[PDB]
Amino acid sequence: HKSEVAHRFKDLGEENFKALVLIAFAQYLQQCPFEDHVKLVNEVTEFAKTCVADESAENCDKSLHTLFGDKLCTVATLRETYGEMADCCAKQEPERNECFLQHKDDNPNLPRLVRPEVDVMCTAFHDNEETFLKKYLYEIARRHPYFYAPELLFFAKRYKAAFTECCQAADKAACLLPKLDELRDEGKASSAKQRLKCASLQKFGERAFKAWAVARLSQRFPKAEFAEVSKLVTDLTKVHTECCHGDLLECADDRADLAKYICENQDSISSKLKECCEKPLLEKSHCIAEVENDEMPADLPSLAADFVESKDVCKNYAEAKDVFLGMFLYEYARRHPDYSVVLLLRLAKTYETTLEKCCAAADPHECYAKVFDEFKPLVEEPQNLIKQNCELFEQLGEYKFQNALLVRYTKKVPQVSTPTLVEVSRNLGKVGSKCCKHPEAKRMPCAEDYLSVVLNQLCVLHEKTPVSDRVTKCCTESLVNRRPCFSALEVDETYVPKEFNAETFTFHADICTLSEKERQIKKQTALVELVKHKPKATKEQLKAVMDDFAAFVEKCCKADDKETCFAEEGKKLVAASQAALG
Ligand SMILES: N=C1C(=O)NC(=O)c2cc(-c3ccccc3)sc21
Ligand SMILES: CCCCCCCCCCCCCC(=O)O
Numbered sequence: 001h002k003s004e005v006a007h008r009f010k011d012l013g014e015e016n017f018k019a020l021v022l023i024a025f026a027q028y029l030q031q032c033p034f035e036d037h038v039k040l041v042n043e044v045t046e047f048a049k050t051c052v053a054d055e056s057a058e059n060c061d062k063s064l065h066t067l068f069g070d071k072l073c074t075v076a077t078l079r080e081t082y083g084e085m086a087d088c089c090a091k092q093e094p095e096r097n098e099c100f101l102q103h104k105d106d107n108p109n110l111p112r113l114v115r116p117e118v119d120v121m122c123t124a125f126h127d128n129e130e131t132f133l134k135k136y137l138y139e140i141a142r143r144h145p146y147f148y149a150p151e152l153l154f155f156a157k158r159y160k161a162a163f164t165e166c167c168q169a170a171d172k173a174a175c176l177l178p179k180l181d182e183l184r185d186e187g188k189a190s191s192a193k194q195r196l197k198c199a200s201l202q203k204f205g206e207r208a209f210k211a212w213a214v215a216r217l218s219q220r221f222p223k224a225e226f227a228e229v230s231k232l233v234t235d236l237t238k239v240h241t242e243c244c245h246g247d248l249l250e251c252a253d254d255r256a257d258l259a260k261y262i263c264e265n266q267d268s269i270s271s272k273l274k275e276c277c278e279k280p281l282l283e284k285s286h287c288i289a290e291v292e293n294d295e296m297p298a299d300l301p302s303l304a305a306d307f308v309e310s311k312d313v314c315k316n317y318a319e320a321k322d323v324f325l326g327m328f329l330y331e332y333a334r335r336h337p338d339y340s341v342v343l344l345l346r347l348a349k350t351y352e353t354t355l356e357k358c359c360a361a362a363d364p365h366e367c368y369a370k371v372f373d374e375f376k377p378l379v380e381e382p383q384n385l386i387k388q389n390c391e392l393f394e395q396l397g398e399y400k401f402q403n404a405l406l407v408r409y410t411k412k413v414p415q416v417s418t419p420t421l422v423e424v425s426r427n428l429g430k431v432g433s434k435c436c437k438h439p440e441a442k443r444m445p446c447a448e449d450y451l452s453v454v455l456n457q458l459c460v461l462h463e464k465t466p467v468s469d470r471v472t473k474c475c476t477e478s479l480v481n482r483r484p485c486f487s488a489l490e491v492d493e494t495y496v497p498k499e500f501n502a503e504t505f506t507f508h509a510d511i512c513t514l515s516e517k518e519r520q521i522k523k524q525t526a527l528v529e530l531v532k533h534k535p536k537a538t539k540e541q542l543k544a545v546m547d548d549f550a551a552f553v554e555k556c557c558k559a560d561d562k563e564t565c566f567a568e569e570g571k572k573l574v575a576a577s578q579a580a581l582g
């Protein structure tokens, strides 16, 4: 293209162009104020319009890297604010852009983003919609500098919708707060997922990623031939590799190219892609990534013929081991969209181990004849965990289910900090609530997706400040062994009980005036401390104390003198409980 910025402006449109330019600048200049960014965006947009008007106009023939880098280097306070980054401006392209990416601060030193009052937000949304939305887009982008810019723009539009609907509702808070919570969680989960995928590529290698991709794509596109799935896997691996390096333009081009190839070859891939392939260029790759599983071919045979019975198993394996294992994983995955990707990789790894042993043995055919028997326990294990946990969840409901998990996990790893046990147990509770409402055939994929984030979150927090070698073992295990390692955790028999603290189990009238959420956290905090003090305490003894505590808060909250009740009845509850535990 004669003018790349003209092409981009016409493809994206003015509104999307301005939004993506704001994100791009916010992600590199994280410490620059909003008003400075708005001025860069307007200057860049006004320049782009001259290129749309005349493709031969001054500087319109320059690359997007050249234009972006040049504009970044005009920022007067670049050296004062970003010392090392100002030295990038002494370089020519493509070295200058490489220098810029190297000096992106992953976790910058910015204060916690405070959610204002509903009436304040809705008034700001009404009085200046553009400035309200774009400022918060700036606030999120500068805090998430590696977040894929178009996906951040996808969230922004869902935020606009939430405010548009709820700020004209009777009860604004009741409408808006749940929607902002939902968007905040999904946004945080999405950010942690992109960082995890990039970390997992470096740690475990390209082969492990290709195996994951074969499984996921085969489940999604079961009508596709293996050769087609293999080509998509190769392309997706390059996309992932390039996007993790963190060059937005290079990442966006590779994603656009793959989305374009998929949409030109729908008949060879999936019948569910028509809707996604009609959407604008900006939304295409994102829509495809989220597409529903296609229906699997009606009358597919068992894998026994090609992978167990055939006399050419060891021969077909030996000539190209990864191709053959890829074909196995393809055939297994497309028949089981109800499996987690990690389960399918456990089966492929089990099949691999068997062939390595058996193809070197006296009678290979005899040796691997029963290999599909070894798959039974691996499939059953997660299915039974879902069955048990979802049966418990239905009996108790979310809050009491979280308390059950809180007691379970405190007894397993009581060395973990109380805040971390509360946070993780509450989050695992939410995974229960979300995935147990799915039908059986979609429960394991749901569980896998949401557990992956909750457990990485736990492993990050824990790896920062280590306290349990067993948690570190599960956190440093292979991606396939991580969840089973956590499931294999036993009650700590060597743990010396925590010494009784009076204040820990002392309560005040303020608990009555706390919000539902913060009151739950205060109770759950106390429940963890109770189990840390008396881990040998039975379900019956714990229930008895928890029931007494429920009666104590009910009585002293609904009292003429609240304060002295909590002091006097609190001393009674404690003494009673200390005699009813051990
Ligand atoms: N409210 C908050 C907060 O407390 N601090 C954050 O870092 C954040 C990130 C969000 C986010 C939203 C959408 C996409 C990606 C990220 S919403 C948000
Ligand atoms: C001047 C900066 C232009 C904005 C950034 C590059 C354009 C991003 C396009 C993303 C859409 C295609 C790929 C995808 O679907 O993810």
Ligand SMILES: CCCCCCCCCCCCCC(=O)O
Residues within 6 Å of the ligand: 340, 342, 343, 382, 385, 386, 389, 390, 428, 429, 431, 432, 433, 435, 444, 447, 448, 451, 483, 484
């Ligand atoms: C208590 C957690 C929420 C309820 C869902 C239970 C899920 C059990 C483990 C599922 C395993 C999924 C991934 C894997 O195969 O390891």
Ligand SMILES: CCCCCCCCCCCCCC(=O)O
Residues within 6 Å of the ligand: 403, 505, 523, 524, 526, 527, 530, 545, 546, 547, 549, 550, 573, 574, 577, 578
């Ligand atoms: C050894 C002193 C024990 C005193 C009571 C400890 C605090 C128990 C918290 C229980 C919270 C869950 C029960 C509930 O919310 O109904």
Ligand SMILES: CCCCCCCC(=O)O
Residues within 6 Å of the ligand: 409, 413, 416, 424, 428, 451, 458, 483, 486, 487
């Ligand atoms: C201390 C927290 C341990 C988390 C265990 C997660 C097990 C599961 O995936 O069900």
